[PDB]
Write a protein that binds this ligand. Structure first.
Ligand code: NVP
Ligand code: F95
Ligand code: MN
Ligand code: MN
Lengths: 552, 413
């Protein structure tokens, strides 16, 4: 039987020849099962006996579960020599981007790969041998005429063949939506149920004329459609059931799986947090190493169990209505958002929790969250959503005007729901007259890590603090912290540290360093702070005085 | 009708670059564009035996309703010695010196030349679908594609032949070709210069070669310079102002050897308040004046290395201003400049940055015949989602994204 499907031309990688692996012998009952299976495949034209001039071979095994044996060909060596193909189904649709349908049928293309022929010039490289008993007579030589299961090009070619077979049907029926995934077909429509079931039958018959069989209406699956970890109804979607185990002990493997399930659930279940649970995975990669759950991790997991206690579903996309995304701050640098078209029904949810570095502020993290949502929206719905954000316009406008990086802000609306995003402190742009001027400096030994941090002021006040287990960097930050502790509500501080200047001028309100947090606490309590910078060791007034004190 | 054989560089495979997700309006425009290009035979659909891909975008040079821009950056790197060594288009150093330089798009001419049949599979591109609902629409080029550095190398002989009557007619006009663009420079009055451009357009039109229809594609490289660093002139210096001044001069001494700050440091003795007024002594004024005379002279020993890449850094200055500098080795600037434009209602950051990158790239092409690699002060994801909204060039430079702020912001004001 010549197949009417146009074969795709396939080449081997340049300079490579076909496989030449010899077949290991198998037991007598495996060989008898292989001869029976291959004779039925030969009748159906899927394989063909070959002469001795073919020098190639690929090993074949046999194994069972039903009461039937199954043939298994190990194409690993042929796959290494096969050309690369156009990457297949790498990105799957997100259900929040599908549109509602009245009826959706799934169709399992039975025996899919073996229904698509294989390039004639390439068939010689798929040769395999059933061994004769005791290796006393010549083995039975076969080669494939269709897409072999487990070959590198079978998924790409089959999907290509399937699309070419479907395109006349879709052209005649633009009122039908088809999505192919592996050997399944999801067919959705808004037709009245009677004529929808008629189009399904017309599709099955169309497929059948190319040798593609599909389940009868008898054995056609029904809601829901378990697909890629989702549960899909024609009018609603959700994730498959998430089961978080109760364990007396937790290893890195168990918590990596736990963060994964929690991440997966966060696309619909609002409020999922994973900051404290992901902190436990820092640095360590021993899969079996037991990690003790911290106090905050136990609470976070408890908070997630309460969220996951009862089901939540998501609605599908209505292109006729606006796209709205709203963000709320959870604290500890954690954010969650919802994308919806109408209240009480979400398209999807999600979170943004990443700190870019050691220090950030809330306005920057909010902008990064809006960016993450803008990218996600373009992928799913092909457009940008209207934003509702817990920030007042004056707060963002003063931030992105003075932020050293370029940024783009979409049209948005202020939602008054606390906690609001705010600028907790703002350094002065010009020095403060009548405010004391602190010349701060620090120094430390790179071996003993013993340090000093102090200041000299124009009023004659001087101070030095001893420091242990510190660096030149930390001392320069301790020096600014010192001058903030010992100054009034207005203060000029002059440092020589470009490092410390870059941190504080970034105006952070959150940090992974306890020291920086304490400096943030002081800057909030101040009224006016001016931070100035001079080069070290250039004869610059009060800087040379405080440099001599802490150097000693 | 006879195709030029093209090959990759030895030991290199074709490009396999991800297609960026696109908005729905750009997917439609790309589908309409490509449906016509396929009817006109320029491109054909391909199958799964073609594993290569090159990203495509939709941009918009002002017109009624969308043009296709292919990011051949990867394929250009992988066919390099074919176009830079074998058929390299040399660079005339006089183009930067002409009073006026006009830029003309001749990329439409490539569409008449067929592409080497065994090379077409490397021009494969994909039109994405919204939410991956359908497999991408896969095309490959049958003719010379715009934005490919091989298209001018192949069309070069045909271009020299078409331009030959115009050059013998106008021996003083400089003509340089970079990819799909012609750069035409003259020393004429701006009125006579625009007439000469129209003449050249009519020459190309007469030989069947279509083209477009004080600023814009019209440049003036004789007014460009390398920009000087400047110190403020004040009547009252506070302790803070002098500390700003000694800080800048200390940074300047990293570039200029002869900078001195001793007389200025000695004004700030003994732990002063920042806001205290310090009148400049005679010795510091002369120290300040001598440093000002050093910064009006070019830094010497700065040379262009054709073996090295050009680097372009940009700083956001606020007030719609942006400063840039082009270099190959740090602190040895080959050019520095500034950019500014003032329409509050229509204008935003990404907008300005995008127009600055295109301006710097054009200055780079005119001067060195090569685009620089940009250190862009922007989030990676933010730039990748919005740069095609304001791109009006047919080429795309290399860029990376700087994540640390510089204090050198005010040092370039
Ligand atoms: C798994 C999958 C992937 C992509 N699209 C769909 C589906 N499956 C559905 O069940 C579905 C449900 C609702 C709307 N579209 C759906 N469909 C589409 C075909 C009508
Ligand atoms: O400027 C330098 O050469 C390094 C340097 C950085 C700094 O933050 O503080 C410094 C300092 O207090 C010194 O006494 C010497 C050098 C530095
Ligand atoms: Mn210091
Ligand atoms: Mn010091």
């Amino acid at each position: 039987p010549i197949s009417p499907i146009e074969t795709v031309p396939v080449k081997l990688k340049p300079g490579m020849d076909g496989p030449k692996v010899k077949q290991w012998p198998l037991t007598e009952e495996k060989i008898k099962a292989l001869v029976e299976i291959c004779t039925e495949m030969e009748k159906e034209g899927k394989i063909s006996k070959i002469g001795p001039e073919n020098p190639y071979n690929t090993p074949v095994f046999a194994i069972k579960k039903s009461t039937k044996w199954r043939k298994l060909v190990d194409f690993r060596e042929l796959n290494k020599r096969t050309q690369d193909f156009w990457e297949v189904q790498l990105g799957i649709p997100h259900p929040a981007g599908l549109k509602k349908k009245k009826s959706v049928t799934v169709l399992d293309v039975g025996d899919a790969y073996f229904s698509v022929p294989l390039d004639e010039d390439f068939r010689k490289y798929t040769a395999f041998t059933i061994p004769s008993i005791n290796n006393e007579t010549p083995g039975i030589r076969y080669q494939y005429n269709v897409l072999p299961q487990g070959w590198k090009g079978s998924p790409a070619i089959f999907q290509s063949s399937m699309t070419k077979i479907l395109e006349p049907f879709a052209a005649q029926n633009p009122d039908i939506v088809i999505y192919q995934y592996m050997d399944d077909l999801y067919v959705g429509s808004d037709l009245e149920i009677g004529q929808h079931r008629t189009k399904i039958e017309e599709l099955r018959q169309h497929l059948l004329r190319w040798g593609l069989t599909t389940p009868d209406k008898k054995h056609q699956k029904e809601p829901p459609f378990l697909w890629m970890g989702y549960e899909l109804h024609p009018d609603k979607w959700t994730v498959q059931p998430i089961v978080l185990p109760e364990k007396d002990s937790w290893t890195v493997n168990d918590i990596q799986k736990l963060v994964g399930k929690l991440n997966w659930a966060s696309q619909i279940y609002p409020g999922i947090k994973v900051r404290q649970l992901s902190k436990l995975l820092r640095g360590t990669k021993a899969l079996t190493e037991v990690i003790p759950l911290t106090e905050e991790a136990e609470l976070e997991l408890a908070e997630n169990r309460e969220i996951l206690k009862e089901p939540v579903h998501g609605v599908y996309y209505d292109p006729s209505k606006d796209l709205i995304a709203e963000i709320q701050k959870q604290g500890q640098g954690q954010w969650t958002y919802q994308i919806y078209q109408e209240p009480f029904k979400n398209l999807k949810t999600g979170k943004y929790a990443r700190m870019r570095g050691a220090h950030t502020n809330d306005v920057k993290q909010l902008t990064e969250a809006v960016q993450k949502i803008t990218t996600e929206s373009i992928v799913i719905w092909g457009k940008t959503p209207k934003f509702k954000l817990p920030i007042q316009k004056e707060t963002w406008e003063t931030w992105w005007t003075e932020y050293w990086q370029a940024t783009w802000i979409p049209e948005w609306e202020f939602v008054n729901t606390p906690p609001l995003v705010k600028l907790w402190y703002q350094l002065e742009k010009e020095p403060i007259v009548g405010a004391e001027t602190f010349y701060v400096d620090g120094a430390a030994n790179r071996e003993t890590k013993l340090g000093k941090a102090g200041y000299v002021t124009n009023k004659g006040r001087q101070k030095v603090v001893p420091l242990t287990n510190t660096t030149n960097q930390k001392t320069e930050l301790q020096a600014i912290y010192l001058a903030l502790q010992d100054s009034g509500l207005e203060v000029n501080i002059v440092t020589d540290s470009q490092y410390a200047l870059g941190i504080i001028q970034a105006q952070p309100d959150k940090s992974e360093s306890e020291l920086v947090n304490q400096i943030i606490e002081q800057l909030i309590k101040k009224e006016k702070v001016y931070l100035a910078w001079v080069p070290a060791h250039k004869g610059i007034g009060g800087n040379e005085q405080v440099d001599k004190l802490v150097s000693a | 009708i006879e195709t030029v054989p093209v090959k990759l560089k030895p030991g290199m495979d074709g490009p396999k670059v991800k297609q960026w997700p696109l908005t729905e309006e750009k997917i439609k425009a790309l589908v309409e564009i490509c449906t016509e290009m396929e009817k006109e035979g320029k491109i054909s659909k391909i199958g799964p035996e073609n594993p290569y891909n090159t990203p495509v975008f939709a941009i918009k040079k002002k017109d009624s309703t969308w043009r296709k821009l292919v990011d051949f950056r990867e394929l250009n790197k992988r066919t390099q010695d074919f176009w830079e060594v074998q058929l390299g288009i040399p660079h005339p150093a006089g183009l930067k010196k002409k009073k006026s330089v006009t830029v003309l798009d001749v990329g439409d001419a490539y569409f008449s030349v067929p592409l080497d049949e065994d090379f077409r599979k490397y021009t494969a591109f994909t039109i994405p679908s919204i939410n991956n609902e359908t497999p991408g629409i896969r095309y490959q080029y049958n003719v010379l594609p715009q934005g490919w550095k091989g298209s001018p190398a192949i069309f070069q002989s045909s271009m020299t032949k078409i331009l030959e009557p115009f050059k013998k007619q106008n021996p003083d006009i400089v003509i340089y070709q970079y990819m799909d663009d012609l750069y035409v420079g003259s020393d004429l009055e701006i009125g006579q210069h625009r007439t000469k451009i129209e003449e050249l357009r009519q020459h190309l039109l007469r030989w069947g070669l279509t083209t477009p229809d004080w600023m814009g594609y019209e440049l003036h490289p004789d007014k460009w310079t390398v920009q000087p660093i400047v110190l403020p002139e004040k009547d009252s210096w506070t302790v803070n102002d002098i500390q700003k001044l000694v800080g800048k001069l200390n940074w300047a001494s990293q570039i200029y050897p002869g900078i001195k700050v001793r007389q200025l440091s000695k004004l700030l003795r003994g732990t002063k308040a920042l806001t205290e007024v310090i009148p400049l002594t005679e010795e510091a004024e002369l120290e300040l004046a001598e440093n000002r005379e050093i910064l009006k002279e070019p830094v010497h020993g700065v040379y262009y290395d054709p073996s090295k890449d050009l680097i372009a850094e940009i700083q956001k200055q606020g007030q719609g201003q942006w400063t840039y500098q082009i270099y190959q080795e740090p602190f040895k600037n080959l050019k520095t400049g500034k950019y500014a434009r003032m329409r509050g209602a229509h204008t935003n950051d990404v907008k300005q940055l995008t127009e600055a990158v295109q301006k710097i790239t054009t200055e780079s092409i005119v001067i060195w015949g090569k685009t620089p690699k940009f250190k862009l002060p922007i989030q990676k994801e933010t730039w990748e989602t919005w740069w095609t909204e304001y791109w009006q060039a047919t080429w795309i430079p290399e860029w990376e994204f700087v994540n640390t702020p510089p204090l050198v912001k005010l040092w370039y004001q």
